[PDB]
Amino acid sequence: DPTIIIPKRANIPTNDLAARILRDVKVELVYNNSLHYVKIRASVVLDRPAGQSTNAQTPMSSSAVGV
Amino acid sequence: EYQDKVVDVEVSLGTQPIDTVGFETPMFLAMHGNFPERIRFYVSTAGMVADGFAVGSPAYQFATNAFAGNFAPQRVAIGRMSIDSSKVDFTGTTEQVVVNITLNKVVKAVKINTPAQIATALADAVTADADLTGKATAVATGTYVTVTAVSPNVVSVGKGAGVYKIVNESSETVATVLPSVIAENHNWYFLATEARSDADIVAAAEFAKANYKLHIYNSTDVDAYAPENSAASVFDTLKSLSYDSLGTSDAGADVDFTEGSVIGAMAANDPSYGDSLHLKTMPGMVPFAGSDTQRSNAWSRNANIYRGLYGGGSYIEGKTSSGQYVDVIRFSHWVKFRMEESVFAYMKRRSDMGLSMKMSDEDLPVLKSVLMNNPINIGIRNGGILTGYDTENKVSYDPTIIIPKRANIPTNDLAARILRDVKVELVYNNSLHYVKIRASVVLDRPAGQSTNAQTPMSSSAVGV
Amino acid sequence: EYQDKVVDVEVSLFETPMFLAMHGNFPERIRFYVSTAGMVADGFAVGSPAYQFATNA
Amino acid sequence: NQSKILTLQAYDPAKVLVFIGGQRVSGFAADTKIVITRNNDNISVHAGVDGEISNALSRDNTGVMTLSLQNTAKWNGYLAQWQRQANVTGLIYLPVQVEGSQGLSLNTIGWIQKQPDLSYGTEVGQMDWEIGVLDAWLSPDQIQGIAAGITGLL
């Protein structure tokens, strides 16, 4: 999310009140990106594809073994 | 003074600012000659390299490790000792060796491709660089190459690529240097040393206890987890003296000086919360690889170990040399410093308007409110200080303050004009370190429970 | 008597009975202690009758 | 356990700043200055017969911002004239900003939805203008942000 910050009067040095110029205003942004290159991976099958695994469990995220 | 535009914008691509935090500046006593002062303050590694520090040098490694923590400070203090020479030990094995060496603002990266042969080749390569020969010197011996700078020149040597050590030698002793260092600036809290001899560590530990500083050291020793009967390591040495110092075993402690990671995980942590170091993650450190018995030995010797669990890395047990938890020591130091600072600040403001404080019953009691402000209340608000009624011992934890009356002050103190015998009490909270669970599983139909509906009686009536 | 610090903190984490013990730890026929810590400093072996009496009292 | 003060400063109503189009509003009513309410619920719930629960987010962020002003305030004229100016020219949108003193804030686009009734009586009257808001998400302006990555679970 874009952000904007403005300093308060108590934080302005006395010198700037004579110069009458404010400083330290800050803004932030995130730039998007276009797409330049793409790489694809195809596959071809000739004979009868082999039967797939018949597991119906919901795939677990990671191994439980950890110490 | 003159601005040509009513509104101006500096577009900085990628970089971002960071807020200003309060912290305790650490001090790293390194040996070098890059500047004359005994101690300097840096805010980024860029400034250190701009001062002639070679990339990969001890101070650079310590700084880059310190600035990477979740609680890292924004200033680092670098001490200075004398320097006689430096060593590049190739003991071990190694394909490409790169050594970064900077000589009198001149930066170069010597290159090389059995340890003795590698050392000899590196020494020959160093002499090939005419600039290095004119201003610096190199000699081979065994598995290490010794390099020395010509007197009017400053040389800095740091790690590049490959496996080897970098050891700097200096005639100045830590015990002699620290008293001079503290004189220039007392504005630092953590203490670290580059030299890793037993005598230097013992001297630093003795100094820290006297001057109210916290000492940290990584030992890189292998006896640290030797069987419990082998009381021959520095860790066991410090126990006998009852000193306090947060020491931990590691493998890269003499190639990276990992004290920076610990400091960065400790610098910006407010002691008022009593936030122990039990499970804090630290970048840079490498997991301890020993087995269970080695870990048990290390724990018995109070040598903390970094361990990896469930994919992450975690410190453990935060214990000090004397056996007391580092958290308690930090809390005690925090109380000791801030009670004094608060009282002094009130007294100075009260005496700066005239009407300085006087020793009488009509003015002394205000110290109760003065002390109940600042530490005694911030600690309660942040949870560091405990309050309430104890049900077991039938005692209360409420903080207490007592002030003596004028009639009880001896006549001598009225001449010395100093008050004594002010008493305060506190109860410290505690974090949670270990937990043990008891589970149960049932397979068949559980048996029917007792159907008693009476209110359970407390204890048997039979007693005479 | 110089005091280098304006404020400093430590942060440090009735009738009297008489017991006629037999020993040779001091010359006087009587002495007064405020705890067993003072007794041990005089060489009183832990668990000795006088030490036991004091710690019980 | 001791009672804790929820804040260091004191909630000052005068510190609440309302900027409509770049100018500060003045001359507020007695009790309440502004009220912000969402038009629709954030999340809907569909409950099946068997007990299965599924939810769908709501993308309707329109809201209403009540604004109370004394009938003697000069800002009544500004809004009244702007109403006809927008009606004729066809431009109704204008920025709206609210700064909280010790609470949430708001910064979005808005428009005038309904003109309040006018009543003349013994005492000074009150007018409660209604200002629409494109998005009614109250945003924080505090140290919040380091804990939002902690409450997360499941």
Three-state helix/strand/coil letters over chain D: CCCCCCCCCCCCHHHCEEEECCEECCCECCCCCEEEEECCCCEEEEECCCCCEEEEECCCCCEEEEEEEECCCCHHHHHHHHHHHHHHHCCCCEEEEEECCCCCEEEEEEEEEECCCCCCCCCCCEEEEEEEECCCCCECCCCCCCCCCCCCCC
Residue in chain B closest to C7 (alpha carbons) equals: B340
Closest in B1, B16, B310 to A28, CB measured: B16
Taking the mean position of all CA atoms in its chain, how far away is CA C52?
A: 13
Query: How remote is the C-alpha of D113 from its chain's centroid?
Result: 13
Q: Which of D2, D5, D8 would you mutate first to test chain B, the one with the most B CBs within 10 A?
A: D2
Beta-carbon contacts of residue D75 (< 8 Å; ≥ 6 apart)? D25, D26, D27, D69
Nearest CA to CA, how far is B410 from chain C (Å)?
16
C-chain CB neighbours of B416 within 8 Å are 1
Question: From the CA of B288, how many Å to the nearest CA of chain A?
Answer: 13
Length reported for chain A: 67
User: What is the stated resolution of the deposited model, in angstroms?
Assistant: 12.7
CA B392 to chain centre: 38
Cα B239 from chain centroid (whole Å): 19
- Provide the pairing of β-strand B27-29 with B76-79: parallel
Among residues D65, D76, D66, the alpha carbon closest in space to that of D27 is found at D76
Of B1, B17, B309, which is closest to A66 when you measure between CB atoms? B309
What phi and psi values does residue B320 have, to the nearest 5 degrees? -100, 180
Distance from CA of D10 to the nearest CA of B (A): 19
| Residue of B168, B161, B128 lying closest to B144 (CA atoms) | B168
Instruction: Give bridge partners of residue A28 from the DSSP assignment.
Output: A3
Entry field: residues in chain B: 464
State yes or no: chains A and C have 3 or more CB pairs below 8 A: no
Q: Decide if D4 and B388 are in contact by the 8 Å CB cutoff.
A: no
Determine whether the interchain pair A66/B3 forms a contact, defined as Cβ–Cβ distance below 8 Å.
Answer: no
CA B282/CA B258 separation, integer angstroms = 10
Interface B–C counts its CB contacts (< 8 A) at 34
At a CB cut-off of 8 Å and minimum separation 6, what does D42 contact? D57, D58
Both tokens of D23, joined, read 């100018």
- State the structure-solving technique: cryo-EM
Residues of B in contact with D4 (CB under 8 A): 381
What residues contact B177, with CB distance under 8 A and at least 6 apart? B29, B79, B81
- CA D119, D124, D125, D129 dihedral sign is positive
CA distance D94 to D100: 20
Taking CA–CA distances from B348, the nearest residue in chain C reads C6
All residues of chain A having their beta carbon less than 8 Å from the beta carbon of residue B3 are: 21
- Cα B384 to Cα B271: distance, rounded to the nearest angstrom: 8
Q: In a 10 Å sphere around its CB, with 0-12 CB exposed, 13-18 middle and 19+ buried, how is residue B3 labelled?
A: exposed
Cβ–Cβ < 8 Å for D60, D39: yes
Beta bridge partner(s), residue D94: D110
The neighbours of chain B, by the rule of 3 or more Cβ pairs under 8 Å, are: A, C, D
Cβ(B147)–Cβ(B99) under 8 Å? no
Amino acid sitting at position C5: K
**Contact, D136 vs D36, CB < 8 A?**
yes
Give the pairing of strands B214-218 and B190-193: parallel
Residues B204 and B27: their CA atoms lie apart, in Å, by: 12
Structure token pair of residue B190: 């953590």
Chain B residue with the nearest C-alpha to that of D4: B381
Is B3 in Cβ contact with A67 (below 8 Å)?
Answer: no
CB B421 within 8 A of CB D34: no
**B389 bridge partner residues:** B396
Using a threshold of 3 CB pairs under 8 A, tell whether chains C and D touch: no
- The minimum CA-CA distance between B81 and chain C, rounded to whole Å, is 28
Q: Which amino acid is at B18?
A: I
Neighbours of chain A (3+ CB pairs under 8 A): B
Name the residue in chain B with its Cα closest to that of A19: B1
Beta-bridge partner residues of B215: B191
Collect all residues of chain B within an 8 Å Cβ-Cβ radius of residue C2: none
Cα separation, B247 vs B306, in Å, equals 12
Contact B332 C7 (CB under 8 A): no
Judging contact as 3 or more Cβ pairs under 8 Å, the answer for B and C is yes
Under an 8 Å CB criterion, which residues of B touch D?
Answer: 380-381, 387-388
Rounded to 10°, the helix B198-211/B174-184 angle is 30
- Secondary-structure breakdown of chain C: helix, strand, coil percentages, each rounded to the nearest 5: 25, 0, 75
CB-nearest to C1 from B328, B344, B416 is B416
Please answer whether residues D19 and D131 qualify as being in contact, where contact means their C-beta atoms are separated by less than 8 angstroms: no
Contact D1 B388 (CB under 8 A): yes
Residue B146, phi then psi, degrees to nearest 5 = -100, 125
**8 Å CB contact between B89 and B167:** yes
Q: Which of A11, A33, A67 to mutate to test the interface with B (most CBs of B within 10 A)?
A: A67
| Chain B CB contacts of C11 below 8 Å | 331-336
Residues from D in contact with B at Cβ < 8 Å:
1-2, 4
Nearest in space to B208 (alpha carbons), one of B218, B198, B217 = B217
CB-CB under 8 Å, B381 with D4: yes
Element (H, E) at B297: helix B292-300
Taking an 8 Å cut-off on Cβ atoms, the answer to whether B381 and D1 are in contact is no
Residues in C closer than 8 angstroms to B338, CB to CB, are 9
Nearest CB to B343: which of C3, C7, C13? C7
Task: Find the closest chain C residue to B422 by CA distance.
Answer: C9
